[PDB]
Homo-oligomer: A and B are copies of this chain.
Amino acid sequence: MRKIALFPGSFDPMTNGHLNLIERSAKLFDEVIIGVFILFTPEEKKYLIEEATKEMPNVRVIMQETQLTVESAKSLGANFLIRGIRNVKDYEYEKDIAKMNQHLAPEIETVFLLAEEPYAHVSSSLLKEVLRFGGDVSDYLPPNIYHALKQK
């Protein structure tokens, strides 16, 4: 029986950090579902994220109208949530979310991987602020996502 992980996010944008963690968890799980919780209509973000993840066969992308993460995993048979931790702040934020999800769905297990060094300082909020003032963050974004994003 499959070990299935949901990797939830708003992926606004998907960064090479997300890709990195996705790549690594595809090795750890039978499958990984990227739940994009809904600049781009759902099926544009879906397009980009499938484009970006195309070379990984056990990885699928699903739009999810906003709801309880654990409800979305239950309805997909995902008994695992997979999250990254990049710093102390991230640790405590993720940890509160995991204790809450454990109360809500005790049979679902949150699993953590640490962010890799080139990406540990990268969050979409700082990315977006830098995108907004024109800075070159092209090293932090999958190329499809960078090219799609010039239409600003």
Q: How many copies does the complex hold?
A: 6
> Would you call the interface of chain A mostly helix, strand, loop, or mixed?
mixed
* Cross-chain contact of A111 among B28, B102, B104, B122 (Cβ < 8 A): B28
List of B residues within 8 angstroms of A110 by Cβ: 113-114
CA distance in complex: A72, B100 (Å): 34
Given contacts A27-B109, A89-B89, A112-B114, contact A133 B67 (CB under 8 A): yes
Within the complex, the shortest CB–CB distance from A87 to chain B, in Å, comes to: 5
A56 within 8 A of B: no
Q: In this complex, which of A66, A97, A114 has the most chain B Cβ atoms within 10 angstroms of its Cβ?
A: A114
Within the complex, the shortest CB–CB distance from A125 to chain B, in Å, comes to: 9
CA distance in complex: A84, B45 (Å): 34
Interface size on A, residues (CB 8 A): 49
CA distance in complex: A102, B80 (Å): 24
A136 within 8 A of B: yes
A57 within 8 A of B: no
CB atoms of B113 and A111 under 8 A apart: yes
Given contacts A68-B130, A135-B104, contact A28 B109 (CB under 8 A): yes
Closest partner residue, chain B, to A30 (CB atom): B3
- A residues bordering B, Cβ < 8 Å? 1, 3, 24, 27-28, 66-68, 70-71, 79-80, 85, 87-89, 91-92, 95-100, 102-104, 109-114, 116-118, 120-123, 126, 130, 133-137, 139-140
